[PDB]
């Protein structure tokens, strides 16, 4: 069949090295297989046992249960060839049930990026996946849209490598409801071009830590570290999202004529500055409030007159913690972000007493 797949690799690449089973090929005799509507499943699989004109008698394969339903209830089941397909445009039966089935069986197999013609569908995994790593970057770098499975890096190279072929300025537009994962994909697009379209001055040094193992450029280091500073002075936990974007942002990355990064500009829209004073039930304020009250060193704690949790009337709900984050070390992280970006040692203390 094909090359074998590593464990990490199986979260982007479909398993296709199996025996050519006669079972689902033989089952094809049930050419009265269809999708029928389901309260639990959205659509479930079932087989037509008579057609009565306008109505159709159907039997659920799953549960053995004969039903009568409409001739327009029944949606058109795809051949077992199309199981976990990369693009929705390849599907012979484009049905609402089939798109739901292909996303569902991809999602539970861990494949969270699926193409859909000229745009993609990305489902939030709520799970750390290995697919974001410095191995994966040089696999997608320069590599065509059908030579690798769909991924945010593929879209990021595709925009970069259309712009230098047509010569039209590009936007990558993240859509979706509140908690959908747009901010993380936005950070993945910036991560990709911060090493693909960056100017290089030499390799080394590698620490003793994890491996995002690349010596990113001087500007590109600052561009990488721009996002956590604005997440500190701008993200807050809501009921829906525990690092909820409480401002909107448009990041314009500028290029030369060769195609290398030369500048970047961040425009910004609606800041929910109303939640600084009072918060909704079970919600947090702007993260920097938690980071500064917890993580401030004993000398600066008296200098900036920082009083404890529940000693400030602009913290409602008391001391709401955040799950999978420790606010104490996030103060050190966001201080290290400010030093790397280019803020002076006194200049940073001036920010904190505000």
């Amino acid at each position: 069949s094909q090359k074998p797949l590593s464990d990490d690799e199986k979260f982007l690449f479909v398993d296709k090295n199996f025996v050519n089973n006669p079972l689902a090929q033989a089952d094809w005799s049930a050419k009265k297989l269809v999708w029928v509507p389901s309260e639990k499943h959205g659509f479930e699989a079932a087989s037509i046992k008579e057609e009565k004109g306008d109505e159709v008698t159907v039997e659920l394969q799953e549960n053995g249960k004969k039903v009568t339903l409409s001739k327009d209830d029944i949606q058109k089941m795809n051949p077992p060839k199309f199981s976990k397909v990369e693009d929705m445009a390849e599907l012979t039966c484009l049905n609402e049930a089939s798109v739901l089935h292909n996303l569902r069986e991809r999602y539970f197999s861990g494949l969270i990026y699926t193409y859909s013609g000229l745009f993609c569908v990305v489902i939030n995994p709520y799970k750390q996946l290995p697919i974001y790593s410095e191995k994966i970057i040089d696999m997608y770098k320069g590599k065509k849209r059908h030579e690798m499975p769909p991924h945010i890096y593929a879209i990021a190279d595709t925009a970069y490598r259309s712009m230098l072929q047509d010569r039209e300025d590009q936007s990558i537009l993240c859509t979706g409801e509140s908690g959908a994962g747009k901010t993380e994909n936005t950070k993945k697009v910036i991560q990709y071009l911060a090493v693909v379209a960056s100017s290089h001055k030499g390799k080394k040094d590698t620490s003793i830590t994890q491996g995002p193992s690349f010596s990113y450029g001087e500007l590109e280091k600052q561009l990488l570290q721009a996002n956590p500073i604005l997440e500190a002075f701008g993200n807050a936990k809501t009921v829906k999202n525990d690092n909820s974007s409480r401002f909107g942002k448009f990041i314009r990355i500028n290029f030369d004529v060769t195609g290398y990064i030369v500048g970047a500009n961040i425009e910004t829209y609606l800041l929910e500055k109303s939640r600084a004073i009072r918060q909704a039930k079970d919600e947090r304020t702007f993260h920097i409030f938690y980071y500064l009250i917890a993580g401030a060193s004993e000398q600066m704690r008296n200098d900036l007159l920082l009083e404890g949790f529940n000693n400030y009337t602009f913290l409602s709900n008391g001391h709401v913690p955040i799950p999978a984050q420790q606010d104490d070390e996030m103060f050190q992280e966001t201080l290290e972000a400010m030093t790397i970006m280019g803020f002076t040692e006194e200049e940073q203390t001036s920010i904190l007493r505000v």
Binding site: G142, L164, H200, G202, T258, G259
Partner: protein, 148 residues
């Protein structure tokens, strides 16, 4: 040919015996012709040797008098390469338009396509022309093979 350079071709032909009975193997024949400047395809040499197999290429022997008309046949070909065509094919693999191909891609194309080189042949060709980033200017790489 003039006798002038045909005399030089005798000295070069004597410099590819390893023994002393004045015979160049069919396996060695292309690379004798390449020593005397020529740049033939493998299928251009093979054709003038009558299309032998790999086994008999070791065992079949040429003298100078029978080697010399082979030189005269391959000397006037119906085409030859230039700079203008040869950069155009390598610039397809120039990822942004940089003036440079990655040394891995250049090693991979020469082995995988056409008259397929060994890994040793590509490594000897490209080494010391790839920078700190492993990137090769195709411009000077073409000038290096064409002009000497």
């Amino acid at each position: 040919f003039s006798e002038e350079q045909t005399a030089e071709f005798k000295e070069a032909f004597q410099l590819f015996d390893r023994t002393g009975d004045g015979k160049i193997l069919y396996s060695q024949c292309g690379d004798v012709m390449r020593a005397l400047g020529q740049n033939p395809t493998n299928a251009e040499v093979m054709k003038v040797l009558g299309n032998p197999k790999s086994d008999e290429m070791n065992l079949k022997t040429l003298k100078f008098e029978q080697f010399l008309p082979m030189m005269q046949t391959i000397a006037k070909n119906k085409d030859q390469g230039c700079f203008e065509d040869y950069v155009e094919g390598l610039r397809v693999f120039d990822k942004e338009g940089n003036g440079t191909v990655m040394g891995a891609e250049i090693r991979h194309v020469l082995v995988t396509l056409g008259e397929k080189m060994t890994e040793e042949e590509v490594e000897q060709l490209v080494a010391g022309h790839e920078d700190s980033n492993g990137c090769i200017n195709y411009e000077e790489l073409v000038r290096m093979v064409l002009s000497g």
